[PDB]
Design a protein around this ligand. Structure first.
Ligand SMILES: *[C@H](C)[C@H]1/C(=C/c2[nH]c(/C=C3N=C(/C=C4\NC(=O)C(CC)=C4C)C(C)=C\3CCC(=O)O)c(CCC(=O)O)c2C)NC(=O)[C@@H]1C
Ligand SMILES: *[C@H](C)[C@H]1/C(=C/c2[nH]c(/C=C3N=C(/C=C4\NC(=O)C(CC)=C4C)C(C)=C\3CCC(=O)O)c(CCC(=O)O)c2C)NC(=O)[C@@H]1C
Ligand SMILES: *[C@H](C)[C@H]1/C(=C/c2[nH]c(/C=C3N=C(/C=C4\NC(=O)C(CC)=C4C)C(C)=C\3CCC(=O)O)c(CCC(=O)O)c2C)NC(=O)[C@@H]1C
Ligand SMILES: *[C@H](C)[C@H]1/C(=C/c2[nH]c(/C=C3N=C(/C=C4\NC(=O)C(CC)=C4C)C(C)=C\3CCC(=O)O)c(CCC(=O)O)c2C)NC(=O)[C@@H]1C
Ligand SMILES: *[C@H](C)[C@H]1/C(=C/c2[nH]c(/C=C3N=C(/C=C4\NC(=O)C(CC)=C4C)C(C)=C\3CCC(=O)O)c(CCC(=O)O)c2C)NC(=O)[C@@H]1C
Ligand SMILES: *[C@H](C)[C@H]1/C(=C/c2[nH]c(/C=C3N=C(/C=C4\NC(=O)C(CC)=C4C)C(C)=C\3CCC(=O)O)c(CCC(=O)O)c2C)NC(=O)[C@@H]1C
Ligand SMILES: *[C@H](C)[C@H]1/C(=C/c2[nH]c(/C=C3N=C(/C=C4\NC(=O)C(CC)=C4C)C(C)=C\3CCC(=O)O)c(CCC(=O)O)c2C)NC(=O)[C@@H]1C
Ligand SMILES: *[C@H](C)[C@H]1/C(=C/c2[nH]c(/C=C3N=C(/C=C4\NC(=O)C(CC)=C4C)C(C)=C\3CCC(=O)O)c(CCC(=O)O)c2C)NC(=O)[C@@H]1C
Lengths: 647, 161, 160, 67, 161, 161, 160, 160
């Protein structure tokens, strides 16, 4: 399996274009309200739509009759309708028995599905659904189906739909032209596939059929020609600002460089030269270079100029070396004066975001580019490309099975988790079921249960956390100290145990009206053991309110396991177990399961208060990789400082 | 954690050398200041709630922080900040007794910035409160030991800012 | 260190140090000059103790030095004298700290697993420190020797 | 900053395969001096023909004061 | 984990069909090698501490790693490295018995790099120590089974890259 | 980014009050230390490659990292490590000149721990390398400005952990 | 600040600050006592400037406070006086910083869009700052006035 | 120059020079006579500054004048002092200009590519200018030397 995941954000491909879709998206890409044009697109469609309902309603009802009259004309030698699911060029009627039942079932359903897609075409009001699904169909159907028989079948249906309807010339012509498009697209052979050639050796070459880029909403492409009237020239410049700055900033804040605008309006500098000068401008520098790391600003510079994310590990490595050498100008210069930029946009065309629909996509930087094309990209300040690309070659990282966000910070108190929304730093990794996470023991390294399972109930001797035990006799256990004995020495020890037992369940010491006084005195009397006392504090409504309720279910399970057992979960096997209990039984039973677990009983007895036994490598790094606490012999060469021989 | 004794021992152990004249003098300096450290800690221990009381009064109280909209508005969040400064003063006392700020990095400052950012706790307001602790502690304890406490309280501030 | 122990105990209870714990450090601080006296004595005659205890071990246990033994050869005996020089250094850290923590942390935990892997008899290393104790005891004062013996017996006790 | 008034046609080699829209390959533009070496090399690698180049911005044989 | 058997089972199960002729051939090839796999495993089981001993003496012993300043100097750290090489030999045997390196990805190399970076475990010195195991195991078991063991031992090494 | 001037302006701007005498003293302190900061920046800029040279030699060279198997074996990795320390030194001078650790939390640290984890770069080693820079920088410039440089180099170490 | 400007420009080119930029900061740092003095004078009579310049604004431009105006009302007049208090505060930040960056980032970017949405005339607010310029110059020496007015006319120039 | 860069920075934002930026030009112009005095000292003693530091190079690094070196012979040594004469002239341009702009564009851009072609050690030329800094510091006053040091150190720093 793969060791890294870039993310799997929802992809929404446009299967076919409708009139409302074509109208709305036209102004959406331009970042405008629907003007007198785009409103009139809808107005004429909504008026005709009532008639377009009557087209389909007749054709949906009489669908059985159209396909029956078609199949009878085409297929000879029996009845084709036994197993229902004008210009002849030179067709020969196909025998029913000779063609075979399996081929006949295909033939019949396609004839119905051709008419079905015609009815959808009128209702949509755009023959896009036809153009896509009919263009590259002649070639694939040629193998085991005659083309000559299909043309006359559609032409029969054209006449069949004409005679059955026949209302008005303003009504029937919609039926006629859509059928006329249908036969013309079917007569047309399969066009050449769109070949996305790799710009260098590092990036793979791709191919996309001439059907996928026929529906998936074409990105509006603006080119600065010197003769254009200044209204559409303004539309080009606004689009150029919408590409570089992700949004129209000249409308928002009136932030515009008129010095550069004037030169492009004339034709002194090209759009290639404009993008160059605009991306090295202090206006871009402040917004997409200054707030970001060198790696992330590089990743943003890719989508602004080239209109795509970095494709390969080698590409990020190359372009980071450029931005380290000469900075932002040198990076911009490398991006504009590339073989890719001049191939896609040339000199005149404004850069555009080439995503799922525009071109063929590679299976490498899918989710990394999906989040990048979003407007929420310049808030993810953690790089997504260089992180995933490096993690691809490496094995599985030190991470919780349900992501990096599921890992809490290894602190004394407070369940603090990285938020998915606030500062996107989600790092998915394909963890399987039987994947045990390597955990660092607080005590001796030999006392790890992975290598030494017998030494699970061994106390950390001044290496890890302090162990609290009810070793000493509880006050008022035996009737030796009769009535009096005001100075019973064994009283402060059990109270310190209670406080520590509170400190383990809830990281911090609680307030006055939060302490369970009933549970405390039962432990002090010797009615319940520590195991029962820890269980009661974790079964408290306060623990539910503070740690369980405000947090994500599996985050709350993970933190509870780090508090009750003092250990992060090894992997899926344990996490799925408690998550199954959380679904069926509830929170209280999850508490019960973690206490009544065998590993709890082995590590901590009936008198032992739980403690931090194991840390995550990331957690220990936070503790012992700071300026202090770090030893000299961790990751540094130690030279023996000896007095010189001349001294 | 490591104290001033352990820090000298560890440094000598890393080299693989016996405790030399330079190492012995570092220990002797700690044992000279040992009487100053214990007496200082006892003063802080006795007036634990008192320092925090006059720290919040100076910096935090009667500000936008206490008033609605501020972070330290609710009684829940007020008692949280009191506890925080109670923790900060106690761990500064530990580092003062030890003569090393190793405990502060291990138990306090380990992902404290990431914690305070996520909750929405103001860094500048917290620093000022620890700065308020420093001035209160120095006025209570003394000049030399108050300076000693002031170093580790600055170390908390530097790790938080 | 006893200072470290007192802080860790106070950290676990999440309280300021007890007046009993503060007086415990105060007594250690005042009696720190005596601990540094023993340490300097052991440091000053480190080459004398190791050589004396070495020869005394090899006479009592000839089998380790005899052909077929673990410490047979001029290079293997040198490692054995180095081993004791490490253990004597660990003692000096213990006396200074006033606690059996630094001896445990550095050169006691995972010693049994270490010497089994090397093929060294663990009881012979326990004897070597016991010989190191005897030489060190007869090179300092009675009060100095008794304080040092507490750390020495901890090295012997854990290894045995 | 010295700029070159450059005139070059750069025909697309992949236009047929990529199936992208037709762009005006002939352009008269100003290009910075620091970029011109990378610009010229890019054009002539695509098989593009350079027609006319003029030093519009700057003085020929300048030592100090460029940008 | 997945062995050579379960890998064939997994592939057949996701296809949703019974084990075909090609699936049976892959099993029979494993069972033919299985006699050599168990034989090698039993020898490594008996000679477990001795292989580690020879590996440490080859690379780690009498070096800067075991000397003061090194990471394999401390006794708790020495015994850790012994146990670490006890892991590597055990899990390499596991993968050798399995016929797949799936267990190495799931348990051994599962965030091993980040573990070793956090503690300060030498990456170069550990790889050489696994190579020291590889050389000893091949000389102890055989030229065929030791080479077969060497594949999974190189997989741990390449996983630490 | 924010400098010491902009930081005290923004703190007054968020409260919506004019700069008072206490806020003015923060500026006067910066205008007093400004001559020390400019002079320090000139020294480090001159010996930019020279400071790194000594720092790598003190900490990184002749260790695990440079040896085969480590994270500084290949020449591409080594050159990237020099580049990284060239980054750290350059941004520490920026923060010193600014008199605020705002640029470090913007362009240096905010998304560095995630990259260093993913690449497999040891953080524990690079922290020691910045500590090696800190010792060289303080020895070259002085005790007054080296302490100032020290804070911002320690800030990077804290953010990496 | 020129410090921020120089660093970010050096950050852009990925280079250390040139000594031709460092001397600019050096001259800026040394000549800071004058800038703080001007700011102290401006903040000293913060209410006095707003009241005088506000009174002169509504005298010259009566349609602002006439029925049908933007600042016509009770709270509407108070908000404009508060707006003047904002821009005067922005000026004082600019004088302190010795740069027009703090004036820009806080309250100058998107001023045209803001006052368009509120329905406030942009040239009348530009007049309001121009009135504030004249009052502030009156309570200051010629050298101090011309320095501060330079920041004032920038605010006027960016609006109108 | 400081002047040319300030115009560039203002034109990049497409605006007039800032009140702060104009003051930095003012600060440069006022101290313009001081900068010319530094240049006059260096240009007046151009022969002595090249001969002293030229000799100091050969005493420090003798491998240059040794057989097999780059500057071996009467002609090759004459080109080495010629090279230093060029760099001394560049420094005088830089102090007058106020920025390291004229030093860069004439003889510092592609300095690595130049001496790599000729087969000259880049560390040796870095040391030669470093010797020129030491002679200049002694002959000139402390305030002037420290100002000129930053321009010299930029030549050394980029050639290192
Ligand atoms: C007081 C100076 C300022 C302040 C404090 C404040 N803190 C919290 C809550 C928490 N405090 C912490 C931090 C720590 N965890 C540790 O491990 C340490 C070191 C020992 C500390 C100091 C944590 C984890 C929390 C979260 C909840 C908990 O108590 O476990 C709050 C409440 C935040 C909330 O909304 O819940 C507050 C207000 N904030 C101010 O306004 C003061 C300037
Ligand atoms: C009056 C009933 C009694 C009384 C009141 C008193 N309170 C304070 C100080 C404070 N009171 C609060 C408490 C709250 N603020 C909140 O947000 C909430 C929750 C809604 C409460 C209950 C706080 C935070 C303060 C500090 C002041 C501030 O807000 O900035 C005082 C002042 C004491 C002092 O100076 O420390 C007083 C007098 N005292 C009595 O004896 C009355 C019976
Ligand atoms: C002498 C008392 C006995 C003896 C010694 C002996 N030891 C080794 C090997 C090693 N001993 C150690 C132990 C330590 N080094 C440390 O750093 C510490 C903590 C401070 C200790 C206690 C180690 C690590 C080694 C390895 C040596 C190396 O540096 O590479 C040997 C050699 C074993 C061999 O044959 O390889 C010997 C002989 N053996 C005896 O028989 C005596 C009873
Ligand atoms: C066909 C009638 C004759 C013919 C055509 C031909 N032209 C070219 C070269 C190009 N023509 C274009 C196309 C356009 N540029 C525009 O802006 C427009 C208006 C929208 C058009 C129509 C372009 C851009 C080129 C250059 C190549 C490219 O695709 O980028 C060629 C190719 C020349 C070559 O060998 O490269 C051809 C064949 N030639 C004939 O023989 C016909 C009589
Ligand atoms: C050396 C033989 C003589 C010389 C050279 C010289 N050239 C320039 C300027 C440029 N040279 C080119 C030309 C090319 N671009 C190409 O595509 C090719 C073919 C592979 C070449 C050779 C370019 C584009 C430049 C501009 C530099 C840039 O970076 O863009 C100069 C500098 C001119 C100036 O005054 O700045 C020089 C000196 N001239 C001589 O004196 C030699 C005899
Ligand atoms: C020996 C080859 C090298 C070496 C080893 C070394 N390791 C540690 C500490 C730990 N080792 C691990 C790793 C694992 N535990 C697992 O579950 C697995 C997968 C099967 C492995 C390999 C862990 C988790 C630790 C931490 C302690 C613990 O056991 O929980 C150390 C000690 C580090 C310290 O400072 O504590 C050492 C020395 N280092 C070398 O010098 C050799 C090259
Ligand atoms: C001998 C041909 C010349 C020479 C050698 C020399 N090198 C160093 C220092 C190092 N050399 C390297 C380079 C590499 N190690 C690798 O792994 C690779 C990739 C295969 C290379 C090219 C490194 C990393 C070092 C540092 C040592 C270390 O491993 O940590 C020195 C020492 C420099 C010093 O004083 O520190 C020397 C002498 N020098 C000459 O004069 C010869 C021409
Ligand atoms: C040197 C102290 C240690 C070290 C460094 C090292 N870094 C890389 C590669 C990269 N460096 C970065 C980090 C940054 N990106 C930023 O934005 C910033 C802040 C301005 C920095 C410093 C990144 C993202 C990369 C990736 C680019 C690349 O591939 O070069 C390497 C190379 C690792 C590899 O080849 O994958 C190295 C070695 N690591 C050590 O070993 C030293 C202790």
């Amino acid at each position: 399996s793969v060791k890294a995941s870039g993310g799997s954000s929802l992809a929404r491909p446009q299967l076919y274009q409708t009139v409302p879709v074509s109208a709305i998206s036209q102004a959406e890409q331009q970042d405008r309200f629907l003007e007198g044009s785009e409103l009139n697109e809808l107005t004429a469609y909504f008026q005709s739509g009532a008639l377009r309902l009557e087209i389909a309603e007749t054709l949906t009802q009489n669908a059985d009759l159209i396909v029956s009259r078609a199949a009878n004309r085409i297929f000879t030698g029996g009845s084709p309708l036994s197993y229902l699911e004008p210009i002849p060029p030179g067709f020969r009627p196909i025998n029913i028995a000779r063609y075979g039942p399996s081929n006949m079932q295909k033939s019949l359903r396609d004839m119905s599905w051709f008419l079905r897609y015609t009815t959808y075409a009128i209702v949509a009001g755009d023959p896009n659904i036809i153009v896509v699904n009919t263009r590259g169909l002649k070639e694939v159907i040629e193998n085991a189906c005659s083309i000559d028989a299909t043309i006359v079948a559609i032409q029969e249906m054209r006449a069949a739909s004409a005679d059955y309807f026949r209302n008005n010339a303003q009504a029937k012509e919609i039926v006629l032209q859509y059928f006329d498009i249908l036969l013309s697209e079917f007569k047309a052979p399969t066009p050449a596939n769109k070949v996305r050639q790799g710009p260098s050796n590092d990036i793979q070459g791709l191919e996309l059929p001439q059907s996928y880029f026929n529906a998936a909403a074409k990105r509006q492409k603006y080119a600065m020609k010197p003769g254009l009237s200044a209204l559409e020239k303004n539309a080009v410049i606004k689009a150029a600002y919408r590409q570089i700055f992700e949004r129209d900033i000249t409308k928002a804040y009136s932030q515009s460089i008129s010095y550069l605008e004037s030169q492009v309006r004339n034709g002194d500098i090209s759009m290639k030269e404009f993008v160059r000068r605009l991306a090295k401008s202090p206006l871009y520098r402040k917004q997409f270079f200054e707030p970001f790391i060198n790696s992330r600003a590089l990743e943003l510079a890719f989508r602004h100029i080239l209109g795509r994310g970095p494709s390969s590990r080698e590409e990020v490595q190359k372009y980071f070396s450029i931005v380290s050498s000469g900075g932002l100008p040198a990076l911009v210069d490398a991006l504009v004066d590339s073989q890719e930029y001049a191939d896609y946009f040339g000199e005149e065309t404004v850069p555009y975001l080439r995503g799922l629909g525009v071109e063929a996509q590679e299976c490498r930087n899918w989710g990394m580019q999906q989040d990048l094309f979003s407007y929420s990209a310049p808030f993810r300040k953690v790089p997504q490309f260089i992180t995933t690309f490096a993690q691809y070659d490496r094995p599985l990282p030190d991470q919780h099975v349900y992501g990096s966000g599921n890992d809490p910070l290894e602190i004394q108190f407070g369940a603090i988790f990285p938020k998915e929304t606030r500062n996107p730093s989600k790092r998915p990794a394909p963890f399987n079921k039987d994947t045990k996470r390597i955990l660092i023991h607080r005590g001796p390294a030999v006392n790890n249960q992975v290598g030494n399972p017998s030494a699970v109930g061994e106390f950390p001797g001044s290496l890890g956390a302090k162990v609290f035990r009810l070793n000493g006799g509880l006050p008022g256990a035996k009737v030796g100290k009769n009535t009096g004995t005001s100075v019973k020495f064994g009283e402060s020890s059990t109270q310190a145990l209670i406080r520590a037992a509170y400190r383990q369940v809830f990281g911090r010491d609680l307030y006055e009206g939060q302490r369970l006084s009933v549970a405390e005195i039962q432990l002090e009397n010797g009615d319940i053991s520590v195991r029962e006392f820890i269980k009661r504090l974790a079964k408290s409504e306060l623990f539910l309110k503070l740690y369980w309720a405000p947090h994500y279910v599996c985050k709350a399970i993970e933190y509870m396991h780090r508090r009750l057992l003092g250990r992060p979960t090894y992997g899926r096997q344990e996490m799925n177990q408690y998550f199954d209990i959380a679904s069926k039984q509830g929170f209280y039973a999850v508490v019960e399961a973690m206490i009544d677990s065998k590993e709890y009983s082995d590590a901590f007895g009936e008198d032992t208060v739980p403690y931090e036994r194991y840390l995550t490598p990331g957690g220990l790094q936070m503790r012992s990789a700071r300026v202090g606490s770090l030893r000299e012999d961790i990751g540094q060469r130690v030279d023996k400082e000896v007095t010189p021989r001349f001294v | 954690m490591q104290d001033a004794i352990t820090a000298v021992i560890n440094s000598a152990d890393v080299q693989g050398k016996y405790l030399d004249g330079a190492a012995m003098d570092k220990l002797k300096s700690y044992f000279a200041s040992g009487e100053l450290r214990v007496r200082a800690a006892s003063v802080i221990s006795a007036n634990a709630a008192t320092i925090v009381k006059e720290a919040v009064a100076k910096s935090l109280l009667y500000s936008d922080v206490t008033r609605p909209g501020g972070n330290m508005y609710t009684t829940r969040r007020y008692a949280a900040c009191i506890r925080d400064l109670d923790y900060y003063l106690r761990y500064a006392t530990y580092a003062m007794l030890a003569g090393d700020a190793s405990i502060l990095d291990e138990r306090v400052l380990n992902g404290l910035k990431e914690t305070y950012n996520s909750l929405g706790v103001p860094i500048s307001s917290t620093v000022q409160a620890i700065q308020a602790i420093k001035e209160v502690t120095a006025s209570l304890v003394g000049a030399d030991a108050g300076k000693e406490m002031g170093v580790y309280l600055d170390y908390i501030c530097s790790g938080l800012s | 260190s006893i200072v470290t122990k007192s802080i860790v105990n106070a950290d676990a209870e999440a309280r300021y140090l007890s007046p009993g714990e503060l007086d415990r450090i105060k007594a250690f601080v005042t009696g720190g000059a005596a601990r540094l006296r023993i340490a300097e004595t052991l440091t000053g005659s480190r080459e004398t103790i190791v050589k004396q205890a070495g020869d005394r071990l090899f006479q009592k246990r000839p089998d380790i030095v005899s052909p077929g033994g673990n410490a047979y050869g001029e290079e293997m005996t040198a490692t054995c004298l180095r081993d004791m020089d490490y253990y004597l250094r660990l003692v000096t850290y213990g006396v200074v700290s006033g606690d059996v923590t630094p001896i445990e942390e550095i050169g006691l935990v995972g010693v049994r697993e270490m010497y089994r892997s090397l093929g060294t008899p663990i009881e012979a290393v326990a004897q070597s420190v016991r010989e190191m104790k005897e030489v060190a005891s007869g090179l300092m004062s009675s009060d100095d020797a008794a304080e040092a013996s507490a750390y020495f017996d901890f090295v012997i006790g854990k290894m045995s | 900053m010295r700029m070159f008034r450059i005139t070059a046609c750069v025909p697309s080699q992949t236009r047929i395969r990529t199936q992208r829209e037709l762009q005006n390959t002939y352009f008269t533009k100003l290009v910075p001096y620091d970029n011109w070496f990378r610009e010229q090399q890019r054009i002539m690698k695509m098989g593009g023909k350079i027609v006319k180049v003029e030093l519009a911005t700057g003085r020929p044989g300048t030592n100090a004061g460029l940008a």
